[PDB]
Amino acid sequence: YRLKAYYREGEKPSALRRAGKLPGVMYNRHLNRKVYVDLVEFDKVFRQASIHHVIVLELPDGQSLPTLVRQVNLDKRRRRPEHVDFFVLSDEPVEMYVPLRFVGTPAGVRAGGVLQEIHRDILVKVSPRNIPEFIEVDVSGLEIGDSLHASDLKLPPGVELAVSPEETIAAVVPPEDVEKLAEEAAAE
C-alpha cells in the first residue's frame, strides 16, 4: 500500500494532532527520522494494512521506502492511535507477525462447540521478498478438548517459526449456558 508521509522537525507533537496529523517515526539499522502521516489516510490505509503487509511511504524526497509498522502507541481512554513506528526494510531477513487463516469446519463446532483461536498471527524469521498474504491452517480434525500447536504448523518455503516450537495456535472450548448456571450457583 501507499501512504503520503512528511518530515517532522519542530512541530508541537500535541498541537500537531489537533490539526489532523498522526505523529510517527521511521527508522532501521541505519535510519532515523521524525515523520507524520495523516490520520484519516493512515486510518483507512492501516485498517486493512495493519501489521502484516508492507507499506511504502512516499516522502516529498520522492523516496519510496518499504516500511512496516514495528509498533503503535494506542492512546488509553477511548482507543485511538497516538504515535506510529516505521521499520524500513532492505534485503536481510526480518522477523514479523504473519497472518493466519484458520480454514475448515472442526469436529468441535459439530457437537456444538467454540471457535477458540490463540495466535491470530505468528512471528517468523523471513526474507523481505517473502510477503505471505497469510498461512493456511488445517484446523478441521480438531475436536472439543483438542488443540493445535506451533510444532504442527505448515510453513511455506524460505520461512521459519521465530517462536517456541510448542506454542499453541487454537483450541475448542465448550458453551456455558444452563448446565453451568444452575450447577455453579449451588456448588459455590
Partner RNA sequence: UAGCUGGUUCUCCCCGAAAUGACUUUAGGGUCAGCCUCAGGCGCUGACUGGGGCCUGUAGAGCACUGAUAGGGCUAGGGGGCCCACCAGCCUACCAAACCCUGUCAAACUCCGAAGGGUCCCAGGUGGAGCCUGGGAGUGAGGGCGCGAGCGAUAACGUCCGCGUCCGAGCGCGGGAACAACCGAGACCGCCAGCUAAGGCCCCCAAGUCUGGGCUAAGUGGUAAAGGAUGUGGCGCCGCGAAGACAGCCAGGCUGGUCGAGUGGCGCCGCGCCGAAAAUGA
Partner RNA sequence: AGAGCGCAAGGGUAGAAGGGGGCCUGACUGCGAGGCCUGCAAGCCGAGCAGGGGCGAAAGCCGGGCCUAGUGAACCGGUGGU
Partner RNA sequence: UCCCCCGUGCCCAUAGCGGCGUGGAACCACCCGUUCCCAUUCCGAACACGGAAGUGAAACGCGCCAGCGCCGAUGGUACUGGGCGGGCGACCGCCUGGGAGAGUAGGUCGGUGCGGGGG
Name the site residues for another protein (rule: CB under 8 A): 46-47, 50-52, 68-72, 74, 76-79, 81, 87, 94-97, 112, 114-117, 121, 123, 173, 175-178, 180-181
**How far does Cα 54 stand from its chain's mean position?**
12
Torsion, CA 34, CA 29, CA 49, CA 65, rounded to 10: 70
- State the binding partner of 133 from Mg ion, RNA, another protein, none, CB within 5 to 8 A by kind: Mg ion
Q: Does position 142 bind RNA by CB under 7 A?
A: no
Stretch near RNA under the rule CB under 7 A, chosen from 50-58, 79-87, 98-106, 132-140: 79-87
Please choose, from the candidates 33, 43, 34, 52, the residue with its C-alpha nearest in 3D space to the C-alpha of residue 3: 43
- State the binding partner of 83 from another protein, Mg ion, RNA, none, CB within 5 to 8 A by kind: RNA
Give the C-alpha distances (Å, rounded to integers) separating 86 from 43, 55, 102.
15, 9, 28
- State the binding partner of 134 from RNA, another protein, Mg ion, none, CB within 5 to 8 A by kind: Mg ion
Sheet holding 147-149, edge to edge: 114-117, 168-173, 147-149
Query: Taking CB under 5 A as the rule, which mask of x and - marks residues 114-133 in contact with Mg ion?
Result: -------------------x
DSSP state of 111: T
Binding test (CB under 7 A) with RNA, winner from 93, 116, 132, 137:
116
Question: In one letter, which amino acid is 130?
Answer: N
Could you give the CA distance from residue 66 to residue 87 in angstroms, rounded to a whole number? 8
Closest CB to another protein among 71 and 105? Answer: 71
Q: Quote the cell numbers at residue 55.
A: 507499506
Q: How many residues can be counted in the chain? A: 188
Q: Would strands 2-4 and 55-58 be described as parallel, antiparallel, or unpaired?
A: parallel
Site residues (CB under 7 A) for RNA? 12-15, 23-25, 27-29, 32, 34, 40, 70-71, 73, 75, 77, 82-83, 85, 87, 95, 111-113, 116, 118, 144-145, 147, 149, 164, 166-168, 171, 173-175
Residues engaged in binding Mg ion (CB under 5 A): 79, 133-134, 145-146
